Amino acid sequence: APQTITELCSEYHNTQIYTINDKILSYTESMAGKREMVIITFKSGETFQVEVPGSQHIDSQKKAIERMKDTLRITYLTETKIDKLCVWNNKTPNSIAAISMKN
Amino acid sequence: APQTITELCSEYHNTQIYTINDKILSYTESMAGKREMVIITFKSGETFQVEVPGSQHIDSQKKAIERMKDTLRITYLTETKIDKLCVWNNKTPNSIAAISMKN
Amino acid sequence: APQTITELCSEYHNTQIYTINDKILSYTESMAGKREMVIITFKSGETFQVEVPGSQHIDSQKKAIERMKDTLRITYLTETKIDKLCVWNNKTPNSIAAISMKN
Amino acid sequence: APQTITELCSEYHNTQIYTINDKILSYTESMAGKREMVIITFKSGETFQVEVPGSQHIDSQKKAIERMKDTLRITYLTETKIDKLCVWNNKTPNSIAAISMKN
Amino acid sequence: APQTITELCSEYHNTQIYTINDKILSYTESMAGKREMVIITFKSGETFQVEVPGSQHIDSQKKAIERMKDTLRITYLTETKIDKLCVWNNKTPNSIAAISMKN
Ligand SMILES: CC(=O)N[C@H]1[C@H]([C@H](O)[C@H](O)CO)O[C@](C(=O)O)(n2cc(C[C@@H](NC(=O)Cc3ccccc3)C(=O)NCC[C@@H]3O[C@H](CO)[C@H](O)[C@H](O)[C@H]3O)nn2)C[C@@H]1O
Ligand SMILES: CC(=O)N[C@H]1[C@H]([C@H](O)[C@H](O)CO)O[C@](C(=O)O)(n2cc(C[C@H](NC(=O)Cc3ccccc3)C(=O)NCC[C@@H]3O[C@H](CO)[C@H](O)[C@H](O)[C@H]3O)nn2)C[C@@H]1O
Ligand SMILES: CC(=O)N[C@H]1[C@H]([C@H](O)[C@H](O)CO)O[C@](C(=O)O)(n2cc(C[C@H](NC(=O)Cc3ccccc3)C(=O)NCC[C@@H]3O[C@H](CO)[C@H](O)[C@H](O)[C@H]3O)nn2)C[C@@H]1O
Ligand SMILES: CC(=O)N[C@H]1[C@H]([C@H](O)[C@H](O)CO)O[C@](C(=O)O)(n2cc(C[C@H](NC(=O)Cc3ccccc3)C(=O)NCC[C@@H]3O[C@H](CO)[C@H](O)[C@H](O)[C@H]3O)nn2)C[C@@H]1O
Ligand SMILES: CC(=O)N[C@H]1[C@H]([C@H](O)[C@H](O)CO)O[C@](C(=O)O)(n2cc(C[C@H](NC(=O)Cc3ccccc3)C(=O)NCC[C@@H]3O[C@H](CO)[C@H](O)[C@H](O)[C@H]3O)nn2)C[C@@H]1O
């Protein structure tokens, strides 16, 4: 298996690593139907989403999507600094695949 | 997908944005049958609910309804400031569709 | 829908509001079979339970029962003050239907 | 229903009450197959388990077993004092049936 | 059942104990498909994973794998010191079977 977020992100088409080194500026959460998603921003001006579950996802991703949203909320609430994100850049806003945090 | 709560809120009939910019004043949670709901209030005087799950909800909202109740509880307990709420205004109290918070 | 815990509680037979205005004194949790329950006490002397799930509970209550127990544990550990409880008084200890907290 | 952990514990065969009045000393958690369990210890020298789910458990205990482990982890991480444990003493280490804590 | 992490770790082939005695340096979490996993590092330079659920796992492990990832996240955010890890050493990074923490 991969040993770092970069190694992992490189295993996928249409991804890139963003170097964030910052806490989340804003957290947005929706339970509106067809828009069950989370959006985060940073003071850098970047916006990212956890996508609505959809037919591009495989069954093993369902719990992982929910875990990612849980991680983003508690990261936000604790002002925990994020190191890097692995995103898919064929979505607007870019779509989160992985997160790393360092202390 | 949308990039802000206001953009997302505009994709729905019977909504409006409330700019709260405050912590939650009170949190009420019920497990009584047919009233399995959360109610929050603000010192502004506004009251909002997460509705009981019903026939208007689609299957993709079931986990999101539970997540939103989770977010309101921890928001209340940590005195985290809410920025905006997207609410459905065809319910009393108005019904939460989305939340945003910024720091 | 109701806008306060008192309005809500008044929708049911065999209920009453306790105005506690205090943190939980003790928290007890059991996973013993047929006693899968939580019991809380207050220094004023009151003792309340979240009942074991049973045939009096409708399906929509199953998640809500689990949520209430979640809520009681984190309220206890954070020494958060409970304002009101709505309880059923046809069970001993009286059984929690809803809780409110204000800050 | 019972009003105290000791009343509850007395309904069961093969149990006893340990009065600990202390934080947990160590927390061990395993996801190794057939050993999906938590082990806690205390400075007084006692070791206790939450048992692996098994054919001795009834279905209502499955969510309760998971809750108990949730509770032991957060209790460990917060240094929260445990007051009493009701344990089954026909297992080695003795097996947790209920827990209480007071503030 | 076992009473220590070491005793438990010895009930499996392809395992060893690492004595960490340290908090987690980095936390990495992925929802990318077929890489739904968590990776941790320490300032020692070791790296460990919770593996993607796979056909080597038995059904009783599915909730435990999710629990272990929950534990690692909160352990990381709280700066909690880990005492030992039991890991499978036939994977790269080595794969977490059990964790212990003492205070
Ligand atoms: C406490 C206990 O019950 N311990 C036993 C342990 C568990 O039953 C088992 O690990 C749970 O699945 O199974 C042990 C163990 O050492 O892991 N075990 C497992 C095995 C099966 C063996 N392989 C198969 O079943 C595939 C196979 C199919 C057909 C024919 C031949 C091979 C096996 O090693 N299973 C565990 C594999 C490990 O899974 C781990 C996660 O659970 C990690 O991912 C490891 O990296 C991986 O090697 N045999 N013995 C024997 C231990 O004494
Ligand atoms: C580690 C690993 O397994 N990585 C592999 C990766 C995963 O297997 C896959 O993403 C898991 O679902 O699958 C890779 C990938 O880069 O994502 N992949 C996937 C695909 C095709 C595949 N397209 C289809 O299955 C539609 C299709 C159906 C029938 C016939 C033809 C097309 C595809 O790109 N799937 C991922 C789509 C991405 O999903 C993401 C969420 O998981 C995001 O939403 C992205 O914005 C979206 O592009 N091509 N390469 C190749 C890569 O090696
Ligand atoms: C982003 C997106 O997909 N937005 C679309 C939105 C969603 O598809 C829909 O809300 C998702 O369920 O559906 C829109 C909308 O504005 O909500 N839509 C939907 C409808 C009719 C549709 N009527 C039915 O589902 C029948 C029905 C009514 C009541 C009970 C049981 C069954 C309807 O308004 N659905 C939403 C109802 C609202 O649900 C909300 C919870 O999700 C709140 O409870 C509201 O108070 C309630 O009005 N008209 N417009 C159009 C909008 O474009
Ligand atoms: C054709 C038709 O519509 N028939 C319906 C029937 C009639 O409307 C009713 O019988 C007319 O009086 O009403 C039915 C019925 O089963 O009688 N009905 C009745 C109820 C009220 C419903 N009865 C049950 O949930 C079943 C039950 C109660 C107690 C012990 C064990 C099981 C009721 O009052 N539940 C609340 C009971 C309270 O539950 C609380 C937890 O939620 C606390 O534990 C309280 O301590 C407890 O008193 N809900 N549905 C449903 C049935 O479908
Ligand atoms: C006519 C009659 O009532 N016969 C019944 C019989 C008697 O009630 C019993 O022998 C009288 O003492 O008790 C029977 C028996 O076979 O002896 N019995 C006894 C038990 C053990 C019994 N099981 C149940 O009560 C659940 C259950 C109910 C109904 C059917 C099956 C399971 C029991 O001792 N459960 C607790 C075991 C403890 O579980 C704990 C966790 O929950 C810990 O792990 C403890 O270490 C463990 O000892 N299971 N079946 C079933 C039998 O049908």
Coordinates of N, CA and C in Angstrom, one line a residue, chain C residues 11-93:
Chain C
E11 N -47.5 17.2 24.0 CA -48.2 16.4 23.0 C -48.4 14.9 23.5
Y12 N -47.9 14.5 24.6 CA -47.9 13.1 25.0 C -48.7 12.9 26.3
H13 N -49.3 11.7 26.4 CA -49.8 11.3 27.7 C -48.7 10.8 28.6
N14 N -48.9 10.8 29.9 CA -48.0 10.3 30.9 C -46.6 11.0 30.9
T15 N -46.5 12.3 30.6 CA -45.2 12.9 30.6 C -45.3 14.1 31.6
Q16 N -44.1 14.6 31.9 CA -43.9 15.7 32.6 C -42.6 16.4 32.4
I17 N -42.5 17.7 32.6 CA -41.2 18.4 32.5 C -40.6 18.5 33.9
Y18 N -39.3 18.1 34.0 CA -38.5 18.4 35.2 C -37.6 19.5 34.8
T19 N -37.5 20.6 35.6 CA -36.6 21.7 35.2 C -35.4 21.5 36.2
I20 N -34.4 20.9 35.6 CA -33.2 20.5 36.4 C -32.2 21.6 36.6
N21 N -31.8 22.3 35.5 CA -30.8 23.4 35.6 C -29.5 23.0 36.3
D22 N -29.0 21.9 35.9 CA -27.7 21.3 36.6 C -27.1 20.3 35.6
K23 N -25.8 20.1 35.9 CA -25.1 19.1 35.2 C -25.5 17.7 35.8
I24 N -25.2 16.7 35.1 CA -25.5 15.3 35.5 C -24.4 15.0 36.6
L25 N -25.0 14.4 37.7 CA -24.2 13.9 38.8 C -23.5 12.6 38.4
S26 N -24.3 11.6 38.0 CA -23.8 10.3 37.7 C -24.4 9.8 36.3
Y27 N -23.6 9.0 35.7 CA -23.9 8.3 34.4 C -23.6 6.8 34.5
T28 N -24.6 6.0 34.2 CA -24.4 4.6 34.3 C -24.9 4.0 32.9
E29 N -24.1 3.1 32.4 CA -24.3 2.5 31.1 C -24.2 1.0 31.2
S30 N -25.2 0.3 30.7 CA -25.2 -1.2 30.8 C -25.3 -1.8 29.4
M31 N -24.5 -2.8 29.1 CA -24.7 -3.7 28.0 C -25.1 -5.1 28.4
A32 N -25.6 -5.3 29.6 CA -26.1 -6.6 30.0 C -27.4 -6.8 29.3
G33 N -27.7 -8.1 28.9 CA -28.8 -8.5 28.1 C -30.1 -8.2 28.7
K34 N -31.0 -7.5 27.9 CA -32.3 -7.0 28.4 C -32.2 -5.9 29.3
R35 N -30.9 -5.3 29.6 CA -30.8 -4.1 30.3 C -29.8 -3.2 29.6
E36 N -30.0 -3.1 28.3 CA -29.2 -2.2 27.4 C -29.7 -0.8 27.6
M37 N -29.2 -0.1 28.5 CA -29.8 1.1 29.0 C -28.7 2.1 29.6
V38 N -29.2 3.4 29.8 CA -28.4 4.3 30.5 C -29.3 4.9 31.6
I39 N -28.7 5.2 32.7 CA -29.3 5.8 33.9 C -28.5 7.0 34.3
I40 N -29.1 8.1 34.5 CA -28.5 9.4 34.9 C -29.1 9.8 36.3
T41 N -28.3 10.5 37.0 CA -28.9 11.0 38.3 C -28.4 12.5 38.4
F42 N -29.1 13.3 39.2 CA -28.8 14.6 39.6 C -28.7 14.8 41.1
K43 N -27.9 15.8 41.5 CA -27.7 16.0 43.0 C -29.0 16.3 43.7
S44 N -30.0 16.9 43.0 CA -31.4 17.1 43.6 C -32.1 15.9 43.9
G45 N -31.6 14.7 43.5 CA -32.1 13.4 43.8 C -32.8 12.6 42.7
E46 N -33.0 13.2 41.6 CA -33.8 12.6 40.5 C -32.9 11.6 39.8
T47 N -33.5 10.5 39.4 CA -32.9 9.4 38.6 C -33.8 9.2 37.4
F48 N -33.1 9.2 36.2 CA -33.9 8.9 34.9 C -33.2 7.9 34.1
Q49 N -34.0 7.3 33.2 CA -33.4 6.2 32.3 C -33.7 6.6 30.9
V50 N -32.8 6.1 30.0 CA -33.2 5.8 28.6 C -33.5 4.3 28.6
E51 N -34.8 4.1 28.2 CA -35.3 2.7 28.3 C -34.6 1.8 27.3
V52 N -34.5 0.5 27.6 CA -34.2 -0.5 26.7 C -35.1 -0.5 25.5
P53 N -34.6 -0.6 24.3 CA -35.5 -0.5 23.2 C -36.5 -1.7 23.3
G54 N -37.7 -1.4 22.9 CA -38.7 -2.5 23.0 C -39.8 -2.3 22.1
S55 N -40.9 -3.1 22.3 CA -42.0 -3.1 21.4 C -42.8 -1.9 21.4
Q56 N -42.8 -1.1 22.5 CA -43.4 0.2 22.5 C -42.7 1.3 21.6
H57 N -41.6 1.0 21.1 CA -40.8 2.0 20.3 C -41.1 1.7 18.8
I58 N -41.4 2.8 18.1 CA -41.6 2.7 16.7 C -40.3 2.7 16.0
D59 N -40.3 2.3 14.7 CA -39.0 2.2 14.0 C -38.2 3.5 14.0
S60 N -38.9 4.6 13.8 CA -38.3 6.0 13.7 C -37.6 6.3 15.1
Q61 N -37.9 5.7 16.1 CA -37.3 5.9 17.4 C -36.0 5.2 17.6
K62 N -35.7 4.1 16.9 CA -34.5 3.4 17.2 C -33.2 4.2 17.1
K63 N -33.0 5.0 16.0 CA -31.9 5.9 15.9 C -31.9 6.9 17.0
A64 N -33.1 7.4 17.3 CA -33.2 8.6 18.2 C -32.8 8.1 19.7
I65 N -33.2 6.8 20.0 CA -32.8 6.3 21.3 C -31.3 6.3 21.5
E66 N -30.6 5.8 20.4 CA -29.2 5.7 20.4 C -28.6 7.1 20.5
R67 N -29.2 8.1 19.7 CA -28.7 9.5 19.8 C -28.8 10.0 21.2
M68 N -29.9 9.7 21.9 CA -30.1 10.3 23.3 C -29.0 9.8 24.2
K69 N -28.7 8.5 24.1 CA -27.7 8.0 24.9 C -26.3 8.6 24.6
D70 N -26.0 8.8 23.3 CA -24.9 9.6 22.9 C -24.8 11.0 23.6
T71 N -26.0 11.6 23.5 CA -26.1 13.0 24.1 C -25.8 13.0 25.6
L72 N -26.4 12.0 26.3 CA -26.2 12.0 27.7 C -24.8 11.7 28.1
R73 N -24.0 10.9 27.3 CA -22.7 10.6 27.7 C -21.8 11.8 27.5
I74 N -22.0 12.5 26.4 CA -21.1 13.7 26.1 C -21.5 14.9 27.0
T75 N -22.8 15.0 27.4 CA -23.2 16.0 28.3 C -22.6 15.8 29.7
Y76 N -22.6 14.5 30.1 CA -22.0 14.1 31.4 C -20.5 14.5 31.4
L77 N -19.8 14.0 30.4 CA -18.3 14.2 30.4 C -17.9 15.6 30.3
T78 N -18.7 16.5 29.6 CA -18.3 17.9 29.5 C -18.9 18.8 30.6
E79 N -19.6 18.1 31.6 CA -20.3 18.8 32.7 C -21.2 20.0 32.1
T80 N -21.9 19.7 31.1 CA -22.8 20.6 30.5 C -24.1 20.6 31.3
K81 N -24.6 21.8 31.6 CA -25.9 21.9 32.3 C -27.1 21.5 31.4
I82 N -28.0 20.6 32.0 CA -29.3 20.3 31.4 C -30.3 21.3 31.9
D83 N -31.1 21.8 31.1 CA -32.1 22.7 31.5 C -33.3 21.9 31.9
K84 N -34.0 21.4 30.9 CA -35.2 20.6 31.2 C -35.1 19.2 30.6
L85 N -35.8 18.2 31.2 CA -36.1 16.9 30.6 C -37.6 16.8 30.6
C86 N -38.1 16.2 29.5 CA -39.4 15.7 29.4 C -39.3 14.2 29.6
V87 N -40.1 13.7 30.6 CA -40.0 12.3 30.9 C -41.4 11.6 30.9
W88 N -41.4 10.3 30.7 CA -42.6 9.5 31.0 C -42.6 9.1 32.4
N89 N -43.7 9.2 33.0 CA -43.8 8.9 34.5 C -44.7 7.6 34.7
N90 N -44.9 6.9 33.6 CA -45.4 5.5 33.7 C -44.3 4.4 33.7
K91 N -43.0 4.8 34.0 CA -41.9 3.9 34.1 C -41.1 4.4 35.3
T92 N -40.5 3.5 36.0 CA -39.6 3.8 37.1 C -38.2 3.2 36.8
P93 N -37.1 4.0 36.8 CA -37.1 5.4 36.9 C -37.8 6.0 35.7

